[model samples]
Every structure is written in C-alpha cells, then in structure tokens.
Target: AYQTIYPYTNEVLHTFDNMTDQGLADVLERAHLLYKKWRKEDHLEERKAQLHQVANILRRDRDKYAEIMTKDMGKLFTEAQGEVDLCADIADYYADKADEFLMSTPLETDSGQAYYLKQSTGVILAVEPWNFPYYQIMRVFAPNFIVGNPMVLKHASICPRSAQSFEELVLEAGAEAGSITNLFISYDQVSQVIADKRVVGVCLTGSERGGASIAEEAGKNLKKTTLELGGDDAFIILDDADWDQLEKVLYFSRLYNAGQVCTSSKRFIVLDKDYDRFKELLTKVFKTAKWGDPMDPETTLAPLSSAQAKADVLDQIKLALDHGAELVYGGEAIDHPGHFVMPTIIAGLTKDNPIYYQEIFGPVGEIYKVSSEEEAIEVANDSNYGLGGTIFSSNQEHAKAVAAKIETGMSFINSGWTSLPELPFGGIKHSGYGRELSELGFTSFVNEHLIYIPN
Candidate 1:
C-alpha cells in the first residue's frame, strides 16, 4: 500500500493499494485497444473537444485539487493552485493548437509532392514526480491524449492521491476509461509495464537513477523514451546586473516551491565585483522568510516533502561541509516536529569537492565567485547537469550572448527560468534528453510518416 502523508503534520492523508499483476495487464491491454480505436480521422474533433473540457474541469475544481496537492507533498497552497492553473493552460494549449501541430506538411520532391504526417505511436507510460504533480502529468497527458495516444501514469509514491485525483478529473471530462489511468505499482511491476509491447513510449521526470533505470528497460523493449531528469541549474549574476531587480528574481528562483523544482537555481555564480553585495542582500532576505504550515496563507517556505527528503538534504549539506564548503548561513535542520530545514547558503566550494557537482534538492543555495564573465560561464557549465540556467546582466545583449554559450537546453537573460506551455523544456547530459511542451513535445513520440507519388 502507498500512503501519502502531509509533510507538515506527518499525518497520513490517503492510502492506496498497489495494483495486482493481472490488474496492471488488464489496464495496458484496454489502453492499447483504446489507442487503436481513437487513432482515426473522425475522432480528431472529439479529442480537441474533450481536451478543452479537461481544462474547464481543472479551473472549475482548482481549489479541491490544489488542496490535495498541498497536503500530499507540502507545497504552499498558493503554489499548488498555480500548478493547477498551469495544468489547465497546458490542456488548453494543445486543444487550441492540435489541428495546426498535427496537420500534414507538403514536402518538396523530385517526383510528386511528398507529405509529412504525424501519427500516434501508441500508449505512453509516464513516470512522473511528486513535485508539481498536476503539471508533470498534464505535460504528458494533454499532448499525447490529444494526438490519440492513451497514458498510463506512475506518479511518485508519496503523491499517489494527486495522481488518482487527476485521473478522476480526466474521466469526468469525458475521456474514455482507458484514455488515462493511474497505477500504484511496485518497481518490479514498472519493469513489466515498460516491457509490454503495447507501451510504445516512456516519459519520466525524476532523479538521474530513476531515469537511467527506466531508459534501460525501454531500450531493451525497443520503445521510445523521454527522460527529464534532475538539474543543478546555474543562476549567473554579472557585475552589471541590477541588484534590486536581481535580488527578488534570485529569491523566487531559489526558494519557490521550497527549492524542490528541477530548474531552481542551485548554484549562484556571481561576478567578484557584485558577489559580496549580492550575497549580503540575499542572506538578509532569506533569513526573514517564514516556514510553517503550507495551508497558512502567510507562510513563505513550507516543509520539505517528507522525512526522507529532509534527511537527504541534511546529508547533502553535511557532505558539502566535509568537502570544504563554507556555510554562509542556515545549514542545519530545524528541531521541529515536521520535516523542516532552514534555508541554507553555502560558499567557497572548491572544484575538487565531491558535493560541488551534486544537485541540492532543497532550499540550499551555492554561491560561487568569479572574476570575469568567461569564468562565470565556466563555473555555470562546470557541473554534470545541463538542464536550464539564467544569465543576469544590465545589458540584454551581453546576457543573451552569455546565454548562448551555456551548455543547457534552455537559458534566460536577466530573468528566472519558467516552464510554459509554449516553450520546450528538457536537458542534456546526465540531466536527460528529449523535449516536453510546445510543438516539439507534440512531435516527440509521433511517427512522421512520409508519403510520395510518382510524377
């Protein structure tokens, strides 16, 4: 059984039993049948209409689902609502653009005109994370379902209720029984699901270890895979940056969702000229941020997702200290009942430190001092992760130039990184590959069938 608990209260909110082997097989078989039935020209309009309804249901019941998410994973109620709204927008985006994205394109050829048509691969098995539970599943659920591919979701064990609630919402919005289903299954069952011939694609958003395991299984089955793994994203602050604007931007980037986001600025690479001032101002602001009940409207920082999350962050901090990291402020966990850790800041980590390259999954920020923009970019790209990053500078041109050099999938200039429905989101290297969202996401698993005729 999977028990989801409130991170703040440490009280069990829901208990879900794992699906039996026969139960799992039955769902996949039904989903495969539905995929074949839905992949027809006549069903296109219905797909769009149902997707629009899904968006409507999300907005209409936003409060209910947001509460479940907040209690399940300790996300602030406000951020949980924002996540739900984003899911609504995602569903609406694909609904609005499905026709345009799936349209056949005329390809120029020596003979008659060739056409490139996008077709569904089949059922997709999505292994999503607890952080941003609604949004994670929506990214895979919305686009693939509209393109005629059903989804079998395996969410983080701690947030099974969130997954079940989302699946209920999809079915309530007129989606077929097999169009979207949630599985509370074990690791062994996951391997079985991935190996099934009906499962054509696998999309996972989680840790590097999780991605590696899923990718290996999918490879063995010759199925397509998209793994959106972990990231230690860099937030570079050049000497010319506006401290006033950059401070707030950096604050939200690091502390939002209690620093659980994959693209949260794990490392702050600041030019030497501005390093002291930036660190001083950020420390003062972070010191004052509140942490308590997520349901409290005034609480700024909620607890970590669970006891395991808290223990993991503490261990990472201790490892960093042992490896010569100087604690700037707030390095210890709180002595409270719930899993709460003070917002931490660490600096003076040498390149040889073992923890220097690891991703800190909590509200800890790493500050690095560099003498030049060249060194700043160097420090930013020095990590094993190449996910998302931000370059802050007064001059947009210079920031844009530096952004171009960063070895990440997505980069921003003088702003925090954001995941929107219209932009592609993913990473390279250990952070994993394959894009999600936007037109690229719609095409990720689609078969680009080519048709040609003699002249």
Candidate 2:
C-alpha cells in the first residue's frame, strides 16, 4: 500500500520505514524525561526568542524544506511554502500569547476560592498526515512547546522527508534535542509509543481510519485523545451572497491543493434561485485552472502526491457520475504523464448518491440545491461529516443564523472557511473531535491544576 515518490529531477531519495515498539517507547521516554526539565524554563520572553529562531530557520531554509515537502507529498511549492509559513506563524503566535492561555484563572469552588493553573501534560504525542505535513506538525508543536509540554511525533511514512525536515527546524530553533521526539517507524510501533504511561495524550490529523485506530488504542490505555480527521465540508450559498465572490472563492476552494485538503469545500449547496448563476460562474472559473508540474510557478493546479491518490480521486468521480450526478465542468483526466486530475465540478447530486456521502478528498465538487434557506441548511447538515462549512449572505444576521443551524463544528459566514492562528479549528461527528491552532489549541495539552486557598 506504500507508494514511493521520486521528487528530485535526477536523484531518488531513501525509502522510509515504520518503527518497532521498543524503539517507540525509547522515544516517548526521552520526551518525558526532557519535559521535566524543559517545562521549568518559565520565561515567556525566552520562549518567544526560541520561537522567533524557529521562524527564522523556517524562512532561511524555506526553499530546501518546501522542496522536500513538494517532492515527498507532490504539493505545489506555493502550497508547501504556505504550510511552512503557517507553522512559523503558529509558533510565534503561541510565543507571543502564552501568558493568556497558560496562566492561572481564578474560579470559585464550594469550599472556597481556587485558581485553575494551566500546566504541561508531560510528553504529548502528535500523529500527523502526509497531505499537509509541515502544517500538522506545527499545529501541535507551536502550541504545546510553549505550554511546557514536550512533543513526540509519529508522522506519515509516505512523507518521511517532510517529517524529518520539521524535526530539524524545531532543533535548529534552539529547542532541546529530547524536547521533540521524531521517530521514523512503522504504524504498528505507534501503539507502543502511545502505550507509555508518560505519554499523557495524543493529537492526530489524518484519515478516519488513522484517527479511529489511534483513538481506540489511546482509549484502551486511558490516555486522552484529540483527533482532527477528514472533512467533506460544504459551501452553502444563500440568496444574498455576491455571485462574483462565490464564483472566485468556489474556484479557489475547489482547486485548493488540487482538492486534497480535508477542509476543502467538497460540497456546494446553492439556493435553487441562484443555483444556475453560481454554476455558470463556477464553470467559467474552473475551466481556466492550469495543471502540470507542482514545481512550476505557472502551474496553479498540481498533480496528486502519488499515482494512487489520483486514481482514488478519479474513482470517486466515476462513482459519482455513475450514480446520476451530472458532470458540469472540468471532469476529464488531464492528458499528461504525471499524476493529475481535472478541476472537476459535479451537479444534481443528492444524499442518496454515494458521492454525496463520500469524502471526495480531491478536486471534485458535488453540487446540491434546495428551494429555501431552511432546506439548504438541512441538506448541508445531513452529512455524517461535520468538520466545517460556509454560509454566504448579504445579511450578516441571516448568514450567522443559517451557519449556526448547520451541524458542522466551524463555519464562516459570507466567506470560505479558513484557519487563523487565533481561531480554534476542528469539527464534530464522524469528522472527528478536538480542536487545533490558537490559544485553545495551545492549552489542550496542559494539566488543569486547581489550587485551593482556604480563607
């Protein structure tokens, strides 16, 4: 099932392997021991300085790191660089805002008054995916490292170079060697790593299969588990949204990472009144997406990370088309030697259609329509996946209310869903539980100690 990627123009890199339990425990233990000392360094300014160093290292080595990620994962260079930037920003975000998140907050208890102190939860495990390797590592790293918790990462084997590069950045940022454990190992060994008592918690960003396996193991061990699984988020267009904006944003959303992103809007819910107009704009925008080599600056849409990912995406498209979905625009496979798929859009899809329920984790959009806004909200919230969604309306109040009704965890009104360092990003239902990024993200891996002051 492992697919090999050759990124460099000439040279092929080493094949990565998963780890054994013995090796995994060693890594976890080292992180545990390191956190004991590392957590004691309490100066926020010093912590911030180290984080700044991380940002510097990322910028300085941006080309090299981005190149490796692009080769290993087949993402466009721009997208890979954006991931690096997001990680650096997250590190700086936590460094600059740590006191607000980690400091004690006063609370009232039955006996008297108490302060809930936020402290690190020892060595925290982060299991990340290959699609957005750098971003996932930084998602956990920036927040946890600032809160005195050391990190142990079990990265996807498919993108070994990306994981290795992330570890190097953390080390180069002046973090202690053991503070961030980077294990190059197999999936079976990940269980042994998490089995360590000192491994207090686990954070994961990957497929439902990966999340379920990790969550199950962690639950059996009585370890806290937080998961950010896949998403087939919806982009809901109400009557009042600017048609031009939706046209532009939908194109951006559909072709984003060539539709390989979990949070990419896989479903488009347009009000019946405006569905035809929205479709026309979408057709025009997607018709123009340039596809070819990921490294090429002119190439806006790039190939899938591997041949199988492309095949997987195409299979889903074929399945949707077979189930009575109308192929609107950009459905043909590109006539190229690389792993590429069309920036496709499908219409007239319904819940009964398997593609409507399936997580099309590629550049294929399934369109749905309803007569009223209530019906729109109902169709949008019907999916087992509820990670995120978007509502567009000229009326802010109407948009907010409609978004609130959608069962997704995160929603953006009048715009496409995006992540900022200040926001708690995650979802509910089969889309998975837990949040990442921002202050909430930083503190999820901390000890909640309540100190009683008897008056």
Candidate 3:
C-alpha cells in the first residue's frame, strides 16, 4: 500500500493499494488494444469533447485540487491554484488546436501529391515528479490524449492521492476505460512497460539520474524517449539592468515554489558594479520575509516538500560552504513544524566548485560577481545542465544579444523564466532533448509519416 501524507503535519491523508503485476499487464494490454481504435477518426470527436470537459472540471474544482497539491508536497495554496489553472489552460489549448496541429502537411513534389500525416503512436509511458504533480501529468496527458494516444502514468510515490485525483478527473470527463491508466508499479514493471511492443514512447520529468535510467531502458527496447531533466539555470544581471525591476524578478525566480522549479533561477550572476547593491536589497527582503504554514496565503517562504528534501538541501549547503563558497545570507533550516529550509544565498563560487555545476533544488541561490559580460556568460554556461535561463537588462538589444549566446534551451529578457501553453519548453545538453509544449509537443509522440499519391 502507498500512503499520501501531509508534508507539514506528517499525517496520512490517503492510502492506495499497489497494482499487482498481472494487473499492470492487463492495463497495458487493454490500452494497446484501445489505441488501435483511438487512432482512427471514429473516436476523434468524442476525445475532443472529453478534453473540453476536462478543462471545465479543472477550473471548477481548482480549489479542491490545489489543496491536495499543498497537502501532498508543501506547495503554497496560491501557487497550487495557479498550477491547477495552468493545467486547465494546457488541456484547453490542445482541445482547440488538436485539429490544426494534427492536420496533414502537403509537400511540393514532382511525383504527384505528397503530404505528411500526424498519426497516434499507440501507448505512451510517463514517469513524472511530485513537485508539480497535476501540471506535470497534464503536460503529457493533454496533448497525447487529444492526439488519440493512450497513456500510462507513474507519478512520484509521495503524491499518490494527487495522481489518483488526476486520473479520476479524466475519467469523470468521459475518457475511455483504457485511455489513461495510473500505475503504482515497481521499477521492474516500468522496464516491462518499456519493453512492451505496444508502448511506443516514454517521457520523463525529473532528475538526471532518473531520466538516464529510464531513457536507457527505452533505448534498450528501441523505443523513443523524451526527457525533461535537471537544470542549473543562470539568472544573469548585466550592469545596465534596472535594479528595482531586477530585485522583484530575482525574488520570484529564486524563491517561487521554494525554488523547486527546474527552470527557477539557481545561479544569480551579477556584474561587479551592482553586486553589493543587489546583495543588500536581496538580504533586506529575504531576511524580513515571513516563513510559515503554506496553507496561509500570507507566508512568503514555505517548507521544502518533505524532510528528505530539507536534508538534501542542507547537505548541499554544507558542501558549498566546505568547497569555498560563502554563505551570504540565510542557510539553515527553520525549527518550525514542517520541512522548512530558510531562504539561502551562497557566493564566492569558482567554476571548479562541486556546487557550481550541480542543481540546488531548494530555496537557495548561488551569487557570482563577474567583471565583464563575457565573464557572466562564461559562468552561466559552465554548468552541465542547460534547461532554461533569464537575462535581465534595461537595454533590450544588449539583453537579447547576450541571451542568444547563452547555451540553454530557452532564455527570456527582462523577465523570469516561465512555462506557457503556447510556447515550446525543454532543454539542450544534459537537461535532455526534444520539446514539450506548443507545436513541438503536439508532435513529440506522434508518427510523422509521409503519405504520397501519384496522379
């Protein structure tokens, strides 16, 4: 049995019995058979209708779902609500654009008429993280289901209730029995799913280790895999940046969701001229910030997702200090009831430091002062993970120019990094490849087959 416990209170809120080995086999078999029909035009209208209703359900019960997120992973209620709303928007986007995105594309050819058809690729396996439980699942579910592919999900064990809730939400919206299945299966079962002939693709959103393991398995089976892995995203502050605007952006980039987001600004690379002033302003705000119950909307800093998350952050902070990085501000855990780690800032880091390339997945920031713009880019691109980043400057031309040179999947000018339903989201380098949203995501798991006819 799997238990969902409130991160703050350590009280079990729900329990789910694990799926039997045979039960999982049955689910995959049924889903594979359903996909044969789901891929046809017969189910298109019903699938779209179910997707529209899913959006309605999301917006209608946003509060209830948000509460589940908060209790499961310590996300602030407001942020949870925002995540839930975004999930709805993602579903609505696919529902409205599926026909357009999946339309056949014609090619000019000497051999009569030729076109490329976007067809469903059968069952897809998704292994998602707990941080943004509902949003993560929806990112995979919204597009694929609309594209007529069946899905199987393996969510983080800590948030089983949220996983169950999401699965139920789709069913309540009239999704077919085998359309979407949630499996509480073992690691061995995951390998089985990948090896199954019917499962075409696998997508994972989590650590580099987890992605590597699953991608390796999918590779061994000759199945396609899409991974959205770790990031040490840099938030570059050029000398010409407007400090007033930057301070607010900096706070949100580093502290939002307690710095759990993969694209959250993990490194703050500031010009030497503005470093002191930036540090002063940041300290003033972070020091006086309220740290309390996440259920309370007024709390500025909530606890980490769980005790293990807090411990991991603590260990990383200690390693940073040990390896010549100085703790500029808050670096200790609060003695509160929940898994609380104080907002922290570390400076004086060199490229060789262990923490320099590692992702700090908590409320911590690594501040680096550079003498020139070239040095700033050097520090920013020194990491192994290249997910996403931001460039802040008053001069838009300079910011855009600098952003172009950064080695990352996506970068924004004058604003913090955020995911949008209309934009492509993913990373290059070790952060994994392929896109997750917009047109790119719509076709990620589909078979882009060429159709030719001689006239």
Candidates in order, TM-scores: namely 0.98, 0.95, 0.98
> For candidate 1, what is the total of clashing residue pairs?
0
Q: Residue 15 deviation, candidate 1, in Å? A: 1.0
Off by over 4 Å in 2: 1-4, 7-12, 17-22, 39-45, 109-111
Tens-digit lDDT track for model 3 on 220-259?
A: 9999989999888988988788878876776788888999
Ranking by lDDT: 1, 3, 2
Q: Write candidate 2's Cα lDDT for 203-242 as tens digits.
A: 9888888889999999999999888988888888877787
| After superposition, candidate 1 runs with Cα above 4 Å error | none
Worst window of 10 by summed lDDT in candidate 1: 38-47
Separate clash counts for every candidate: 0, 4, 0
Q: Candidate 2: global Cα-lDDT?
A: 0.80
| Clash list (residue pairs), candidate 3 | none
Q: Point to the candidate with the largest TM-score.
A: 1
- Model 1 lDDT per residue over 1-455, tens place: 57889999898978989999999989999999898897754588887899999999889989999999998998999999999899999999999998899899988878887898899989999999988889999998999988899999999999988999888998899888998999999989999999998999899999988899989999999999998998999899877888788867867889998889899989998877877887897798788779998999999999999899989999999999998999998976587777898899999988899888999899998899899989988988898899999888899998888899999999977777788999999999899999999998888889999888878
TM-score quality measure for candidate 3: 0.98
What overall lDDT goes with each candidate model?
0.90, 0.80, 0.88
